Structures are given as C-alpha cells and as structure tokens.
Amino acid sequence: GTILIDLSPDDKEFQSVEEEMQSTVREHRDGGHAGGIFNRYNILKIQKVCNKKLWERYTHRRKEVSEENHNHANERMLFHGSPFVNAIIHKGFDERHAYIGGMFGAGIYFAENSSKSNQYVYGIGGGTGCPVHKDRSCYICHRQLLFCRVTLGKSFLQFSA
Amino acid sequence: MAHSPPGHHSVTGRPSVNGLALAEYVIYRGEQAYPEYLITYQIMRPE
Numbered sequence A: 001g002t003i004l005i006d007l008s009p010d011d012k013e014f015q016s017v018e019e020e021m022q023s024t025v026r027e028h029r030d031g032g033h034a035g036g037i038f039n040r041y042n043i044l045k046i047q048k049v050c051n052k053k054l055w056e057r058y059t060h061r062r063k064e065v066s067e068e069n070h071n072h073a074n075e076r077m078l079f080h081g082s083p084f085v086n087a088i089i090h091k092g093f094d095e096r097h098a099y100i101g102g103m104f105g106a107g108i109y110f111a112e113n114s115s116k117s118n119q120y121v122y123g124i125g126g127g128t129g130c131p132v133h134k135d136r137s138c139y140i141c142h143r144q145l146l147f148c149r150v151t152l153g154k155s156f157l158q159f160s161a
Numbered sequence B: 001m002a003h004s005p006p007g008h009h010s011v012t013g014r015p016s017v018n019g020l021a022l023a024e025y026v027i028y029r030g031e032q033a034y035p036e037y038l039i040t041y042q043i044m045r046p047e
C-alpha cells in the first residue's frame, strides 16, 4: 500500500529537507573509508512516502509512548541509511532492519548527521561499495537515504567515544 | 532485537571525544519510526 510522491524542487518541503541533508555533513574519523570523500551532495530526487497502514502503526505507538511520558513523544526527524531501504518503505521498520552488532545493542539506529547514515547505504562499514563499480566512494552511482519521523520517549543517555 | 533499558523508550548515543559529531539514537521497536522521505542523491567529489 505504499505510494511515492515526487516533490518539486520549488516546493518549500523539498527545500527544507535538502537543507537538513546538506547542512549535517561532517568529516568522519575513517577518512572517508566507509562512505566516501565528500563535503556535499547532488540531490536528484525527494519523494514523500505514503502508506496509511504504516502511518497508523506509527501514531498508535506514539500515543502509547506519550501517555507513558507526561504527554511528550519526544519526536525527532533523523536519517537512516540501509541496504534494506526498499523493503523498509513497503513493509515498515522491523527486527530484520536492526544493526545486530551495534554498540548500543541490537536495535534500529538513526543519525542527526546525514553523512553518518551515508556510511551504511552499501552495508555495515560501506560493505564493498556500489554494486556496479565496487567503490565505497563512487561519485557516479545513485544512493538513497531515508529521513524519518522517530519517537524517542524517555531516552537513556550513553556518553561515548 | 534487544530491549530498551527498563523505564526508557530509546537510547541516545552522545558524542564524547569528537566535538563536531552529532548524536545517534536507537529504538528497539520498529513501530517507533516512520520513513517519511526517500532521498535519492550522489556524493560529490571535492574540487
């Protein structure tokens, strides 16, 4: 039941999503090993993901969390990069999309830095890079990231390297 | 998947060495995220 609706580049919504993508690029400690060497992106398309059943699943849970946290969902907009992007937009997030070996345990991981999510587009550590050229720093091939609505509720703070 | 720590709905990973890094977050229930935008892009070679 998912449909994808293209946003026009003249649309305010396109422009505010592009600005969050571009302005949250940083340098990474691996020198570009996982995600490539870059300071900015060429945005090719932005699409709104529309699925009534998946939206109602999200809002049902948001309301449960809010009622457990003094009517505060603590909702954020965060990036997610994954080899499973195509399954996620059709079926929603579930246990199959978790980073089993993540340093905060098996869960679904999201980033404020779009460039952090870019490291996972082709798999953990960048995998073997793009399928066509086997290049983690490929400048030709088209990549996809998700910009997601995320309910944090009461969040456990881990101070970490 | 693992469970959230007792009494919590998520984990926040605060950067503690690299002063430029932003936070990372983990949820343990797929129902706590909705994939609202799909962004297609290329990384650009610095000049």
Ligand SMILES: Cc1ccc(-c2nc3c(O)cccc3c(=O)[nH]2)cc1
Pocket: A079, A080, A081, A082, A083, A097, A098, A099, A100, A102, A109, A110, A111, A116, A117, A118, A120, A123, A124, B024, B025
């Ligand atoms: C199979 C798999 C593994 C990790 C990710 C992932 N990890 C992240 C992380 O460890 C920190 C911040 C963001 C991400 C992310 O976007 N995807 C996505 C899919």
Ligand SMILES: [Zn+2]
Pocket: A130, A131, A132, A133, A134, A135, A138, A139, A140, A141
């Ligand atoms: Zn390529």
